[PDB]
Amino acid sequence: ATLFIADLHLQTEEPAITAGFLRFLQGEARQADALYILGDLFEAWIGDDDPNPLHQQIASAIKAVVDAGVPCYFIHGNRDFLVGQRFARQSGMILLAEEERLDLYGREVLIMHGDTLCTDDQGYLAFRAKVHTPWIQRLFLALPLFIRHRIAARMRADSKAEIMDVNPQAVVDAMERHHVQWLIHGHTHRPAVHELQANGQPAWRVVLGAWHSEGSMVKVTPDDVELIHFPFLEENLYFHHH
Ligand SMILES: CC(=O)N1CCc2cc(S(=O)(=O)N3CCN(c4cc(Cl)cc(C(F)(F)F)c4)CC3)ccc21
Ligand SMILES: [Mn+2]
Ligand SMILES: [Mn+2]
């Protein structure tokens, strides 16, 4: 089985999500054929030279899965688009492009984070165009770490002062550009299975859920596609009247 997760938004202020991800990496991920992380693994990223200890804890936990024989892949999200090759080497993950076509047990599946499908939020897509410009990234990464920390903290507070869903035609355009009947993405935080038509045949868009109160993953087997929700920590059972 191949596993897909996204929108974990890991941060030191949310240790329960971190503990759930570590339990997921030590358990379910070890039995998988592969693990794909489709963006927004971290709530924020200002560069691989960030000494945030959470980054090294996550990197060593993913590396343990990679050392256990499970290849791990990463597609950038809107929050952690600055994740680079330094963290990829520390974690053993392979960085993929914003759109990838996979062969999962015979069926061709398109994977992406999903923010590029939300073409109705032109305010966001302008922001995305800027921060994805290579010379803007090189200039930001050259700034000192404490400057980058203060830039990110101010932009988060300013953005805090409602995620737009995908555009239906953008979905059709992507699945026809890649000639696929299956699409998996996250970003929108609306876990669902949508039926549509692409390339003159029925197609399906599978959406991952954010790790808010419980975990979320998509499991693709040769026999089916599964959207699975599970608790973060081990919910130890313990023991009404007639
Ligand atoms: C809609 C959306 O996605 N948002 C909204 C707010 C937000 C903050 C983060 S962040 O905290 O992780 N961080 C990432 C790197 N950022 C950056 C990068 C570059 Cl290349 C140039 C610049 C420059 F503009 F300062 F030059 C700033 C600083 C902020 C991530 C995503 C988002
Ligand atoms: Mn997200
Ligand atoms: Mn996102």
TrEMBL record:
Co-factor requirement: Mn(2+)
Catalytic activity, reaction form: UDP-2-N,3-O-bis[(3R)-3-hydroxytetradecanoyl]-alpha-D-glucosamine + H2O = 2-N,3-O-bis[(3R)-3-hydroxytetradecanoyl]-alpha-D-glucosaminyl 1-phosphate + UMP + 2 H(+)
Keyword Glycoprotein: no
Membrane-topology annotation of the record: Peripheral membrane protein
Keywords annotated in UniProt: Cell inner membrane, Cell membrane, Hydrolase, Lipid A biosynthesis, Lipid biosynthesis, Lipid metabolism, Manganese, Membrane, Metal-binding
Binding-site list for Mn(2+) 2: 40, 78, 113, 187
InterPro entries linked to this entry: Calcineurin-like_PHP, LpxH-like, Metallo-depent_PP-like, UDP-diacylglucosamine_Hdrlase
Ranges of residues in domain Calcineurin-like phosphoesterase: 1-191
Subcellular location per the Swiss-Prot or TrEMBL entry: Cell inner membrane
Pathway: Glycolipid biosynthesis; lipid IV(A) biosynthesis; lipid IV(A) from (3R)-3-hydroxytetradecanoyl-[acyl-carrier-protein] and UDP-N-acetyl-alpha-D-glucosamine: step 4/6
Pfam families linked to this entry: Metallophos (PF00149)
Cellular-component GO terms for this entry: cytoplasm; extrinsic component of plasma membrane
GO molecular function per UniProt: manganese ion binding; UDP-2,3-diacylglucosamine hydrolase activity
Details of cofactor binding: Binds 2 Mn(2+) ions per subunit in a binuclear metal center.
PANTHER family, alphabetized: UDP-2,3-DIACYLGLUCOSAMINE HYDROLASE, UDP-2,3-DIACYLGLUCOSAMINE HYDROLASE-RELATED
Entry function: Hydrolyzes the pyrophosphate bond of UDP-2,3-diacylglucosamine to yield 2,3-diacylglucosamine 1-phosphate (lipid X) and UMP by catalyzing the attack of water at the alpha-P atom. Involved in the biosynthesis of lipid A, a phosphorylated glycolipid that anchors the lipopolysaccharide to the outer membrane of the cell.
Protein family membership: Belongs to the LpxH family.
Protein name listed in UniProt: UDP-2,3-diacylglucosamine hydrolase
Upper taxonomic lineage: Bacteria, Pseudomonadati, Pseudomonadota, Gammaproteobacteria, Enterobacterales
